[PDB]
Amino acid sequence: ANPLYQKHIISINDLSRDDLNLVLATAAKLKANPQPELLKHKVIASCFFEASTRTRLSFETSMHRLGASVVGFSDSANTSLGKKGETLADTISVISTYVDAIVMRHPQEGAARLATEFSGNVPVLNAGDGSNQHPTQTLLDLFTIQETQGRLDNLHVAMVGDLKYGRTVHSLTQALAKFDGNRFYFIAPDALAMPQYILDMLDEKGIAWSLHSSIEEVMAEVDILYMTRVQKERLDPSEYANVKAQFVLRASDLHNAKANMKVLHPLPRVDEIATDVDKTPHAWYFQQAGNGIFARQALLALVLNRDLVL
């Protein structure tokens, strides 16, 4: 039976290097020969207690591409749950009484791991829990670095944007720190800097990093430039505007990019990457989102299948 069989994918900190490679090699195989009936007769719950369309449509398409049925809800705007004080332990004790895996997003951190204490043997896969984890976004980003760069080690990865509160850059720095010789360049407004617990883990593992203030200082050496959105309310209107709105990428800036460099953005991008970047070979944000299908498919294939045929 494969290692991931019937596991809960709750946190990146819980997956080993080995675990991460396995998911990535299965994604590569399913992207190459489809397996449209692998999860035939499985029913999977898509519980989005917090609405997230991008993530939901992606997760359910990939459940659909392996042959599974989907039942579920998207809420934030009412869909009767927690109705009349019903706890989340209780909702999950009732949903696991009839679906074969629960995919869930929830506003509070810790909610997917609590689901785990009540779901019996139905695997729980986390699609986001407040400001804590989002594994399936890190799996798709990793898959995309690997497929475009050929490797996951010895990379020069720049992380540009709001690094203090960008929940995805924090997990991608932890995943990449599992591999060797990567070098990190953080480029953030002072108010939005990469927190200490990250930096402290990088130092302790002997991994190199450095802060720069503009992308021009580092463009030439860079393989993956991962942009994040600054949310305008983490700053006031005039802080955003005043001199910090210059963590914006444009085509002109890409001149000296290595031929292999790729630009990644978990999306919505709104300001930070100008529309003229789209026409360049380095724009890989949309192809990154399409890889969400294979990464996500691979996790559901590995978790529901004892043995995998390939």
Binding site: K232, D236, P237, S238, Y240, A241, N242, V243, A245
Partner: protein
Amino acid sequence: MTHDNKLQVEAIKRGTVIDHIPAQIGFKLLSLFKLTETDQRITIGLNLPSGEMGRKDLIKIENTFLSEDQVDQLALYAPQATVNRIDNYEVVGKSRPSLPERIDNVLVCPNSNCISHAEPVSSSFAVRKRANDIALKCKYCEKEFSHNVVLAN
């Protein structure tokens, strides 16, 4: 009437010639300071060869004399221009722009929450600190920004 030519065109009688405009600021100035809404003959030369910048722009507006504060509004766009005022084919006056104290109308408050965006008021900024690099403060929201920033949004 005097033997014009296009590498440095010649003589208007009576009026203003703004010369030694950096390349590509000339159109900017035509549109921004609405110089064109006149019935006078304007002659304009773009990307010309000259006095060492190599390549420059130049604007000639006959019979209009724009001055003293008008000339100063030109300062963060064309600080090294010369505003010759001409009368009966003689350059009877040579001004250069200096930083103004107020720049009305032309700029846009980078602060998305100030009220000036939505309304029948024109922009106004107080200017501070010459050439080591200018600060502009909005009249309305009293937020001070770097000129490099007001000059993009």
